[PDB]
Each structure stands twice: as structure tokens, then as C-alpha cells.
Amino acid sequence: KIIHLTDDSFDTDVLKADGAILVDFWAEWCGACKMIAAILDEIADEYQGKLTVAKLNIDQNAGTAAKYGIRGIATLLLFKNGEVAATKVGALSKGQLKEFLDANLA
């Protein structure tokens, strides 16, 4: 149930979205990105109903990565109503991601 994002679809899929959206900004040559990838599916399943998880490859979608100042580093942005509600940069554990979501979701 993870949404695949492109520069083309970001507005519709994320900014014009209903409900909180967790966007994972990632790249292939990025080790922290793989640690985050490893835990996203479980998280998506556990927060179904109050969160949607999405991925944007920043090598293929340089437009949106530039807009949010990603600068090539593993980044999670939580979106609500077209705005960034919370930010996490770099690798983190299943536990730290649960904390992040629980602290920043209703």
C-alpha cells in the first residue's frame, strides 16, 4: 500500500491529499535510505487508517527534492493538508519511527 510518487504526481498524491502522508525521500546510493526502506512496509500496515506512506526517488525526481531542500540525504517528511507537519533526517529504527509518528499524528 505504499504510493509511488513522481514529480508529475506529487501535487495530487501528496499536497492535495486527504489524511496525513508520510513521504520517504530516497536514492539508490544511500545506505541510510535502505535502513528506512526496511521498516516502511510494516509501518504502513500498522498505521493503516490514519496514515498513507509514499516514496519519492530523488534521483529520478529532482524537482520535488529540490523544493524541500532534501540535498541527497535520507529524509522523511510528514504532510498534512499540503504542508510539512514534521521532519526526520537520516536513518532511524522501527522504534524511533513509531515515536516520530505517534508524536506527530493526531
Author numbering: 3 to 108
Tell me, in the authors' exact words, what the paper reports.
oxidoreductase family that is found in all three domains of life. trans-to-cis isomerization of the Ile75-Pro76 peptide bond. specific conformation and local environment of its active-site cysteine pair.
possible mechanism through the replacement of all prolines by alanine. rearrangements in the segments 39–41 and 92–95. Trx0P at 25 °C and pH 7.0. Trx WT, and that Trx0P is more oxidizing than Trx1P. redox potential of Trx0P relative to Trx WT and Trx1P. 75–76 bond thus made Trx0P a significantly worse substrate of TrxR. as DTT reduced Trx0P even faster than Trx WT. completely abolished the function of the protein as electron transfer catalyst. independent evidence for a Trx0P-like tertiary structure of Itrans.
